[PDB]
Amino acid sequence: YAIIKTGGKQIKVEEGQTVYIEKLAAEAGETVTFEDVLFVGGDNVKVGNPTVEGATVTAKVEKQGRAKKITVFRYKPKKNVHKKQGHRQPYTKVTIEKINA
Amino acid sequence: PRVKGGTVTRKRRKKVLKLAKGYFGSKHTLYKVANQQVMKSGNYAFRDRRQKKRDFRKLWITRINAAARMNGLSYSRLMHGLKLSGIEVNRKMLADLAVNDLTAFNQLADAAKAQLN
Amino acid sequence: QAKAVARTVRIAPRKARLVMDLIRGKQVGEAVSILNLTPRAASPIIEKVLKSAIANAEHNYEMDANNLVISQAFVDEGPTLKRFRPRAMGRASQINKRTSHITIVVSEK
Amino acid sequence: MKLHELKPSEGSRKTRNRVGRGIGSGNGKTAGKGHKGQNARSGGGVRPG
Amino acid sequence: PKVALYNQNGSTAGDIELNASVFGIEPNESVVFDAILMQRASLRQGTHKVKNRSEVRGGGRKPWRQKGTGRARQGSIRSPQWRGGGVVFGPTPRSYSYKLPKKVRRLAIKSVLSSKVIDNNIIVLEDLTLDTAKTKEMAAILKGLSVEKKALIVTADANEAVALSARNIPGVTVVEANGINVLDVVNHEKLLITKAAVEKVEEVL
RNA sequence: AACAGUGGUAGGAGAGCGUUCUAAGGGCUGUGAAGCCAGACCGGAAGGACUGGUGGAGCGCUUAGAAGUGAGAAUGCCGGUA
RNA sequence: AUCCUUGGGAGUCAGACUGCGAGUGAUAAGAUCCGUAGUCGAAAGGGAAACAGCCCAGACCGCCAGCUAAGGUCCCAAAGU
RNA sequence: CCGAUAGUGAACCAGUACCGUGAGGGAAAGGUGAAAAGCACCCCGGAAGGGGAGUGAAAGAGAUCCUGAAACCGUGUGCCUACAAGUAGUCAGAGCCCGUUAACGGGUGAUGGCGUGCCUUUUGUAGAAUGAACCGGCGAGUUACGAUCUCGUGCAAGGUUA
Numbered sequence A: 001y002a003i004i005k006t007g008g009k010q011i012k013v014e015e016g017q018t019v020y021i022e023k024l025a026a027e028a029g030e031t032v033t034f035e036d037v038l039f040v041g042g043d044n045v046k047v048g049n050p051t052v053e054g055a056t057v058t059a060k061v062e063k064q065g066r067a068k069k070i071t072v073f074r075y076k077p078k079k080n081v082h083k084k085q086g087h088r089q090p091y092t093k094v095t096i097e098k099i100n101a
Numbered sequence B: 001p002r003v004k005g006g007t008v009t010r011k012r013r014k015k016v017l018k019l020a021k022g023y024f025g026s027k028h029t030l031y032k033v034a035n036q037q038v039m040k041s042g043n044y045a046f047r048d049r050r051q052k053k054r055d056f057r058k059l060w061i062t063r064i065n066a067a068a069r070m071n072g073l074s075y076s077r078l079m080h081g082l083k084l085s086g087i088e089v090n091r092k093m094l095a096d097l098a099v100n101d102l103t104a105f106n107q108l109a110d111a112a113k114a115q116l117n
Numbered sequence C: 001q002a003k004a005v006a007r008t009v010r011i012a013p014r015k016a017r018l019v020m021d022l023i024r025g026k027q028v029g030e031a032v033s034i035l036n037l038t039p040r041a042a043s044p045i046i047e048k049v050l051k052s053a054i055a056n057a058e059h060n061y062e063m064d065a066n067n068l069v070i071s072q073a074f075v076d077e078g079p080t081l082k083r084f085r086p087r088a089m090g091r092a093s094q095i096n097k098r099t100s101h102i103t104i105v106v107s108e109k
Numbered sequence D: 001m002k003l004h005e006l007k008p009s010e011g012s013r014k015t016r017n018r019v020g021r022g023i024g025s026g027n028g029k030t031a032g033k034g035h036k037g038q039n040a041r042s043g044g045g046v047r048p049g
Numbered sequence E: 001p002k003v004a005l006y007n008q009n010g011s012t013a014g015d016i017e018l019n020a021s022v023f024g025i026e027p028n029e030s031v032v033f034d035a036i037l038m039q040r041a042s043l044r045q046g047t048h049k050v051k052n053r054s055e056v057r058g059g060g061r062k063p064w065r066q067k068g069t070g071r072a073r074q075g076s077i078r079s080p081q082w083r084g085g086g087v088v089f090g091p092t093p094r095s096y097s098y099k100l101p102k103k104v105r106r107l108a109i110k111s112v113l114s115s116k117v118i119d120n121n122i123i124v125l126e127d128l129t130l131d132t133a134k135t136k137e138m139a140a141i142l143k144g145l146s147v148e149k150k151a152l153i154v155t156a157d158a159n160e161a162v163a164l165s166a167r168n169i170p171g172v173t174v175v176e177a178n179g180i181n182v183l184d185v186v187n188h189e190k191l192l193i194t195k196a197a198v199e200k201v202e203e204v205l
Numbered sequence F: 001a002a003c004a005g006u007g008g009u010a011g012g013a014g015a016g017c018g019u020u021c022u023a024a025g026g027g028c029u030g031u032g033a034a035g036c037c038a039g040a041c042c043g044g045a046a047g048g049a050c051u052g053g054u055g056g057a058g059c060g061c062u063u064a065g066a067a068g069u070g071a072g073a074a075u076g077c078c079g080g081u082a
Numbered sequence G: 001a002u003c004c005u006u007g008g009g010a011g012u013c014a015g016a017c018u019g020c021g022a023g024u025g026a027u028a029a030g031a032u033c034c035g036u037a038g039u040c041g042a043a044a045g046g047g048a049a050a051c052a053g054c055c056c057a058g059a060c061c062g063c064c065a066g067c068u069a070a071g072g073u074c075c076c077a078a079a080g081u
Numbered sequence H: 001c002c003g004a005u006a007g008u009g010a011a012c013c014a015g016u017a018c019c020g021u022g023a024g025g026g027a028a029a030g031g032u033g034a035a036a037a038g039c040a041c042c043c044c045g046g047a048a049g050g051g052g053a054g055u056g057a058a059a060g061a062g063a064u065c066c067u068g069a070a071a072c073c074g075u076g077u078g079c080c081u082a083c084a085a086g087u088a089g090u091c092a093g094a095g096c097c098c099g100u101u102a103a104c105g106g107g108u109g110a111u112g113g114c115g116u117g118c119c120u121u122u123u124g125u126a127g128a129a130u131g132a133a134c135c136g137g138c139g140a141g142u143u144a145c146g147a148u149c150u151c152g153u154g155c156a157a158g159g160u161u162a
Helices: B008-016 B034-048 B062-068 B075-084 B104-114 C014-020 C043-061 E029-040 E102-118 E135-144 E160-164 E195-204
Strands: A002-005 A010-013 A019-021 A031-034 A057-063 A070-074 A083-087 A092-099 C068-072 C075-077 C100-108 E122-124 E152-154 E173-175 E191-193
Touching (some): C014 C043
Parallel strands (some): E152 E173
Antiparallel strands (some): A002 A010, A019 A092, C068 C100, C075 C100
């Protein structure tokens, strides 16, 4: 299982586990390799001088879509203030294949 | 032209009440108390969208000491060890997770103790 | 399954939910005998509706009327009369003459 | 000018400030007049000079 | 504007030559727009009236006293806060006409006529002779001159032959020689003229 | 595209969404209009749309214009029900 | 990166608290009345147990990212018996 | 311009009813269906009130008689509750139950971390300061005429005409 900085925030990843990360274009349908793998694991080929030299992980970008709509609504509890922000969040349904040590 | 506006009021009343299901009592039923309680539960929302971002860290730091003390170290010393032996930028939920599959964490704790001497 | 509806006989509803809650679930051989003896004098309003509901199931469908399970028995506040009743010191309060709608859905076992 | 596509000039029409409708518009509650002060009450106002 | 004349059947050889100062102006897109809107306005009648608070036929004594019962202040019965009415401000009947300058007023009709020349929509109908006055004559002529929709007919004479016809024809409007105006030309898409009225209109203005 | 900013009362400026009516045509209705109720849909919001059910005759879109143009608070008003 | 004029357009002309300097006071008061500086007012977040004025710091919006300030590091309660 | 809380107070046997000794004040109240075809007959019931039967497109349309919302009042329920201290929510969260305007689904959420309504008025209000029982409807910045500034348009030491 592989630990990957794409984010910037880190994911535990085995091969095939669908992982939602940031919007990264990836032209959804194409393939992107991930480039900051810490802690190969399994046989514990453990990190050192951060980033296992070239232990990258390929991934097949499938979908680029927005999250649930979330209503940011802050209001001051007197004083007549109302700020109602509809909000979306862009993910990318990254499908991950061939953890490469 | 005379403007009744007999519809426009209704549809605003029937979107807040859409957003007010599952509320206790007759805050869910009425309007003119519910528009307070939605107004809280948006202001109560945004605070709590900054707690899970700040308090899940206050989980996994306990979930390091509950493993770092199995190997005889403290979080105040352990997170110094990872900062030296290794420049490891491991996610604190994921140096946690390193607990789900122990002893992968201990072998990182093994990497800690080498520069503790 | 059968249905009888009362539709606006003057009694309060809460003075007829109490007569009703010895019926919902009972039998025809277990409710006409019980309603005659409550005494709770909103009873024979209902007992002229249950017995009329059975003789609906007698004529209109022939559902073996002595073998029926009383299924639904809800009562709703119908069209309310409202009267002003006078009061001392010029108060003139109100009296709400309520009205109810008795529905005794009688069904097969 | 086809009466379908009847659009005005460049910056000659402009919306009236609909004063005193809702909070988030600006100028909703006090309707621009302010707070406790001769001027904020109805009916003016004082003599000009 | 060198538009070919029309025989109203033929139709036809020979072209006319129009004023550049009338039918050859680059049309002013926003000086026209102002002139439709004073034309649409003041065609409205302005007969909207609301019984104001004073003007409502209503008892003016206070319903109850100032201070001393468990109510509100509640001055008059027929006010604005009550069921009985009425509207506070309300609409009162009033005016809508206002006159633009003639250096605009010319240059509106000078614009729209010049615009419709470019868009190939003027068909000059010589002499407009009608041998009877039935509407079935104008049914054939407009269809024979291959126009369908709302249409203007500029008669330099205000004919009884033309104007008794074509008004029951639901789109086509018979116009006075002097009676041209912007909500007739813009609306009815197309305008039919005598040879004599082009002499007239170019020496109206 | 680069760089910086983006709490906020009283208030100033700017941009919008709504509703009703009129004006151009263009376009939906008995193969079901408006309104009503439901629903897990979309935009930054005001807000829109779609399918179902009821409803049984009207209605939206665009583009401008007019305004009795928007509701939570008036010990407001009326009616209903606690 | 502000300032000067010019014009359109308004709000406030009762402020509080803390420190520093003052008067009245009894070198009394969450007292009154000035200067100066902050904050509140118009400012949410963390501290100070709760706390408009102290300490730290400025909320466009999401993240189950990291590093720090005031304050802490036995249990409550995150972090050194 | 209004479309029944509007428009006259009165679309309705309205200056009626009621209120006042009296001058006076002064309401509410529209809609079956295209036409009565307004429910013959049978069953329950004293009778209203129903259930079948027919009438019509509809009868859930049948006497407040088109539409029928909400407060409310019910009846069934899927999930939670009888060691619990709570401005009642939010974020986390297993169990259980369903399958959707196909979406990092929907409902209940055992329990944990946070958290004292909305508005006015204030230096300061969770306020033990005021306001509101709720629900629905009505309800407040214009309009007429001038003066000033920006914005726009036409004409430019010449512009507008009452």
